[PDB]
From a paper:
dArmRPs are currently being developed as modular peptide binders. In these proteins, a varying number of internal repeats, binding the peptide, and capping repeats, which shield the hydrophobic core from the aqueous environment, are stacked together to form a superhelical repeat protein. Designed ankyrin repeat proteins (DARPins) are another class of helical repeat proteins which have been engineered as an alternative binding scaffold.
A crystal contact was found between the DARPin paratope and the dArmRP binding surface. The first helix of the DARPin (residues 145–148) was unwound and formed a longer loop instead of an α-helix. This was probably caused by both the crystal contact and its resulting forces as well as by an altered interface between the shared helix and the DARPin. Although a target peptide was added in 1.5-fold molar excess prior to crystallisation, it was not visible in the electron density map.
Author numbering: 3 to 397
The structure:
């Protein structure tokens, strides 16, 4: 008539390893429940008795037993910060997204206390970071900015990067949307995207025939390329330039615009990074796009060329050798005042080179038009024409 169930509950909670073993051998119900539904596994998880947790599971304990609140052993181990028990429970099939009667999941309980190693393990095993409880609170809400956000962000970005390798374009697309959102965050977020390993996957996606994938991938890449020179170098080192140059032949004008914007951002870096753009063969396509009827594409190519021409004399000469000057001089007759200003800036950069570069500018007939625009009634164009003529005339 011994109450083996009661004795087992008490032995499990007290950490009496030998007594648990003996009670189980004598037929105690491993899934005994107390007055509010706690099983021996609940109590051992709460108290942190790893050996007893393992013995109970070996003897068939229900890893997902619910008490009357809906708490599982995983809830209790997460709440109490018992990391090794969390791992053992998950290894034995614990429900990582189980919710109690008010919608609380194990991740909520780990986050609220700052059990950040458990947070990491739960996320690694598929815990949902956006899970909301009865009052709309996510685990992030309950963490109160205790370091949870960095751990969750690391996990969210690495999962998004892995989805870029999926074999469904819709999975790739929705992941690119979220990565694009992160890249939109500017310098305070972009390094997290780089550190998640996104750049190689983004570059590889530039071979996709799916134009929506190309558009979202380029959007993310261009924003990363708007960072510092070390971030530009990561884009280059990921292999972006040959793929970007290929896309300058795209029939899609949005892809064309985004590719030029990304190339212009890269070309806004250091001299070696300008040289990478040249070495990838971008200049022929850039010069051809100066004839584009689309003014946004025209202006984006103009700006990229001006950035390239902000480099050394040999890089300026590469622009000249690609035939840019006749097209640039033509653009000084543009009715559009933005294109006129950007053409003056690019030509001024070219004119800031050496004697050889200055001579090509004069032979292209730029002096006639620079001195004419020196008196232009628009002050901005007047400035650029003045400064450009100065660069041409100095040294
Ligand atoms: Cl533990
Ligand atoms: Cl922890």
């Amino acid at each position: 008539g011994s109450d083996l169930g009661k004795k087992l509950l008490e032995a499990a909670r007290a950490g009496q390893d030998d007594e648990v073993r003996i009670l189980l051998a004598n037929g105690a119900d491993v899934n005994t429940a107390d007055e509010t539904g706690f099983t021996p596994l609940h109590l051992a998880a709460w108290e942190g008795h790893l050996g007893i947790v393992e013995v109970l599971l070996k003897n068939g304990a229900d890893v997902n037993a619910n008490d009357e609140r809906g708490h599982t052993p995983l809830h209790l181990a997460a709440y109490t910060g018992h990391l090794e028990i969390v791992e053992v429970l998950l290894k034995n099939g614990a429900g990582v997204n189980a919710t109690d009667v008010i919608g609380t999941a194990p991740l909520h309980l780990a986050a609220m206390w700052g059990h950040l190693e458990i947070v990491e393990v739960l996320l690694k095993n598929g815990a949902k970071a956006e899970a909301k409880d009865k009052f709309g609170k996510t685990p992030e809400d309950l963490a109160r900015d205790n370091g949870y956000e960095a751990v969750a962000r690391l996990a969210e970005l690495a999962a998004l990067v892995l989805k870029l390798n999926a074999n469904d374009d819709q999975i790739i697309q929705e992941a690119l949307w979220k990565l694009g959102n992160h890249a939109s965050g500017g310098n305070l977020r972009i390094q997290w995207v780089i550190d998640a390993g996104a750049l190689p996957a983004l570059v590889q996606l530039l071979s996709s025939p799916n134009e929506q994938i190309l558009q979202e991938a380029l959007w993310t890449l261009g924003n990363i390329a708007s960072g510092g020179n070390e971030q530009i170098q990561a884009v280059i080192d990921a292999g972006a330039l040959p793929a970007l140059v290929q896309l300058l032949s795209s029939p899609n004008e949005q892809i064309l615009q985004e590719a030029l914007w990304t190339l212009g951002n890269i070309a806004s870096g250091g001299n070696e990074q300008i040289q990478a753009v040249i070495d990838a063969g971008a200049l022929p396509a850039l010069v051809q796009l100066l004839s584009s009827p689309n003014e946004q594409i025209l202006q984006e190519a103009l700006w990229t060329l001006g950035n390239i021409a902000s480099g050394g004399n040999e890089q300026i000469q590469a622009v000249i050798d690609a035939g840019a000057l006749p097209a640039l001089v033509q653009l000084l007759s543009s009715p559009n005042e933005q294109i006129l200003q950007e053409a003056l800036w690019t030509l001024g950069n070219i004119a800031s080179g050496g004697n050889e570069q200055k001579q090509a500018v004069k032979e292209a007939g730029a002096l006639e038009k620079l001195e004419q625009l020196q008196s232009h009634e628009n002050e901005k164009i007047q400035k650029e024409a003045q400064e450009a003529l100065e660069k041409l005339q100095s040294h």
